[PDB]
Amino acid sequence: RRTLWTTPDTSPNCKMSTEKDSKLTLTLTKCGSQVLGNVSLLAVTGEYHQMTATTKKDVKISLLFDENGILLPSSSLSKDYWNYRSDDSIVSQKYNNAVPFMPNLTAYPKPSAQNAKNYSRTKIISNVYLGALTYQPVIITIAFNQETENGCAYSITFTFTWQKDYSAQQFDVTSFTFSYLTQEN
Amino acid sequence: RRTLWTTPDTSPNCKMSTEKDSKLTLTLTKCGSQVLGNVSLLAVTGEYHQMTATTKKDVKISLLFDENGILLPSSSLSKDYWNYRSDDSIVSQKYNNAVPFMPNLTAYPKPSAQNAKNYSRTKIISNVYLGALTYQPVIITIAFNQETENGCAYSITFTFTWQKDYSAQQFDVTSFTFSYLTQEN
Amino acid sequence: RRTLWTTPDTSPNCKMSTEKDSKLTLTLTKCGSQVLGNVSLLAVTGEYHQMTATTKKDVKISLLFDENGILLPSSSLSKDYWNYRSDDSIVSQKYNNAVPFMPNLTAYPKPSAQNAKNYSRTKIISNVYLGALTYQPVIITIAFNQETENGCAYSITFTFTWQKDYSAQQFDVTSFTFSYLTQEN
Numbered sequence: 001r002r003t004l005w006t007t008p009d010t011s012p013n014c015k016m017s018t019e020k021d022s023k024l025t026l027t028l029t030k031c032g033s034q035v036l037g038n039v040s041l042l043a044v045t046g047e048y049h050q051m052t053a054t055t056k057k058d059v060k061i062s063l064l065f066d067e068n069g070i071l072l073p074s075s076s077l078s079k080d081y082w083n084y085r086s087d088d089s090i091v092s093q094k095y096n097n098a099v100p101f102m103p104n105l106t107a108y109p110k111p112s113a114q115n116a117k118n119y120s121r122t123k124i125i126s127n128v129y130l131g132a133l134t135y136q137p138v139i140i141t142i143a144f145n146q147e148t149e150n151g152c153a154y155s156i157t158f159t160f161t162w163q164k165d166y167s168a169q170q171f172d173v174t175s176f177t178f179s180y181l182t183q184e185n
Numbered sequence: 186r187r188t189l190w191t192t193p194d195t196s197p198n199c200k201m202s203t204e205k206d207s208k209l210t211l212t213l214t215k216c217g218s219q220v221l222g223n224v225s226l227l228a229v230t231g232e233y234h235q236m237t238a239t240t241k242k243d244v245k246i247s248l249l250f251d252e253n254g255i256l257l258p259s260s261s262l263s264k265d266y267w268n269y270r271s272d273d274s275i276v277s278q279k280y281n282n283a284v285p286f287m288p289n290l291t292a293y294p295k296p297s298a299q300n301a302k303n304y305s306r307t308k309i310i311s312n313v314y315l316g317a318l319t320y321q322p323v324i325i326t327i328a329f330n331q332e333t334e335n336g337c338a339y340s341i342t343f344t345f346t347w348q349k350d351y352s353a354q355q356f357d358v359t360s361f362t363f364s365y366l367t368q369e370n
Numbered sequence: 371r372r373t374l375w376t377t378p379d380t381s382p383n384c385k386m387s388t389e390k391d392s393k394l395t396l397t398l399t400k401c402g403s404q405v406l407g408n409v410s411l412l413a414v415t416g417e418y419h420q421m422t423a424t425t426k427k428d429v430k431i432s433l434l435f436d437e438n439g440i441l442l443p444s445s446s447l448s449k450d451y452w453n454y455r456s457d458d459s460i461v462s463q464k465y466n467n468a469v470p471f472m473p474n475l476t477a478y479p480k481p482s483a484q485n486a487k488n489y490s491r492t493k494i495i496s497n498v499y500l501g502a503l504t505y506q507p508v509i510i511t512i513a514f515n516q517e518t519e520n521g522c523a524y525s526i527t528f529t530f531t532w533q534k535d536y537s538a539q540q541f542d543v544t545s546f547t548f549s550y551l552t553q554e555n
């Protein structure tokens with residue numbers, strides 16, 4: 001069908017600090033040339049569930065994909081928790097081609113180490129809000145195809161950075177809508 | 186078809202302070218698993234048409250829906266002004282099922298009074314701009330399924346909050362794009 | 371098909387200061403009642419490729435369309451670089467009707483000179499980031515049908531304004547997602 005997602009439940013599927021300490025809620029809906037994306041992140045256990053003054057205010061969630069658009073196991077997100085939608089769940093077969101969901105490699109080329117400075121269009125930068133409190137911004141940076149980790153063909157990364165002291169709080173952010181150009185259609 | 190909307194005209198349809206003092210422009214377009222939403226709000230009469238120093242800088246527009254996805258009459262938005270699109274208008278039959286437009290209850294569960302602190306992913310927080318002037322932010326908070334008013338099955342609320350003194354101005358904001366996960370597909 | 375775009379390559383197609391000094395990357399995907407848009411801008415040559423302290427911190431990119439939704443040659447964007455998608459390129463026939471991609475004239479009416487103050491819903495205002503650096507905001511203002519230049523039927527303009535001193539840098543911004551109501555469906 002035309003949605004890849006994590007499912008909308010709260011079962012931990014992602015690494016912020018340690019394995020499966022967090023729930024990434026990510027939905028990618030194919031709209032022709034573009035994917036319409038929706039993302040949020042919640043810490044369920046570990047450091048980011050009850051932050052301290054020294055907790056690093058920078059968290060990168062990496063989704064690395066192979067040439068078939070299939071998630072690599074070195075990704076932050078667990079493979080078992082990511083697939084095509086069926087009802088409120090995911091399909092049973094694990095290895096379904098997803099090239100039409102991948103970010104376009106002409107729009108968003110892989111880095112070349114010389115320039116060490118790619119096109120800014122490879123990123124989206126905005127704010128989401130910790131605890132859904134309007135005075136608690138967290139910068140979200142979405143980057144397309146900027147990883148080289150583990151021979152990936154494509155990548156989507158979500159980086160959350162902040163400056164304010166959110167010690168004693170649970171990391172949880174508002175939802176963010178975005179789009180990107182796809183490899184196929 | 187695949188759009189629910191208010192129509193794009195300027196005929197008042199909504200309550201900010203009193204009945205039908207304002208035009209909510211809202212379009213919900215079904216894109217599979219997600220709705221693509223577009224919203225703006227204009228005060229046509231009453232307090233928010235010519236604000237004062239004491240006008241409350243917090244306005245909640247509530248859309249409450251029943252189990253069929255049909256707007257409840259206790260909503261801020263008038264029933265008569267909300268339906269499936271036809272041309273630049275709305276269809277003639279008033280009571281059309283709209284469950285596929287409703288926010289997903291697994292992604293966006295109704296509150297349980299104990300925790301008194303739901304998932305932050307149930308909200309979207311950003312800024313729109315009063316008068317389309319870049320120095321006049323208004324915080325927009327969109328919340329999914331967080332109301333319990335009048336036995337609603339689903340809800341979408343738009344809250345506009347601000348801190349700057351917009352006395353002597355008409356409330357009118359720029360358009361805001363968003364998406365959310367739907368109950369069905 | 372259902373995408374109008376510039377293509378995702380880096381071949382200059384647009385005027386910031388002089389002809390074809392910049393690459394506008396713009397994709398418009400038809401989703402029923404709405405277009406899902408994605409935009410970014412890069413200066414390849416001229417003033418905006420290496421800004422100075424006096425470079426004007428205001429750049430308007432104008433797309434003017436005729437009654438058939440076809441770009442007028444007085445637009446900032448070159449005609450030769452804009453058309454319906456095929457693969458990663460554009461179709462061969464140059465003059466394809468695109469009314470279903472045009473911004474809705476009821477939602478976004480042309481100005482009437484008296485009020486000299488249209489509906490704020492005709493604009494979207496947010497920030498994108500120069501160099502994809504989180505401390506370098508650039509205000510993006512998208513306006514629908516607000517031009518009268520050259521007898522246009524429709525218009526979409528992208529204005530980039532800023533206040534910080536970005537001297538010695540290349541103008542290049544992060545991607546921005548938006549939507550608008552269309553004339554037809």
Ligand SMILES: CC(=O)N[C@H]1[C@H]([C@H](O)[C@H](O)CO)O[C@@](O)(C(=O)O)C[C@@H]1O
Nearest residue numbers: 127134135136137310311312324347348
């Ligand atoms: C939605 C939004 O823009 N929130 C912003 C808030 C609000 O403007 C003020 O709390 C009240 O207006 O101000 C900040 O300085 C803050 O609190 O950290 C930045 C933050 O991004």
Ligand SMILES: CC(=O)N[C@H]1[C@H]([C@H](O)[C@H](O)CO)O[C@@](O)(C(=O)O)C[C@@H]1O
Nearest residue numbers: 312319320321322495496497509532533
């Ligand atoms: C689009 C945007 O971000 N606008 C912001 C403006 C501009 O940054 C400055 O007016 C000029 O740069 O600054 C604010 O402090 C303001 O005016 O209230 C917050 C507001 O949200």
Ligand SMILES: CC(=O)N[C@H]1[C@H]([C@H](O)[C@H](O)CO)O[C@@](O)(C(=O)O)C[C@@H]1O
Nearest residue numbers: 125126127139162163497504505506507
């Ligand atoms: C994504 C975002 O909101 N960036 C904002 C940054 C960051 O908040 C701080 O650099 C660190 O938090 O602050 C600004 O004052 C700035 O740098 O110009 C406004 C800018 O829009």
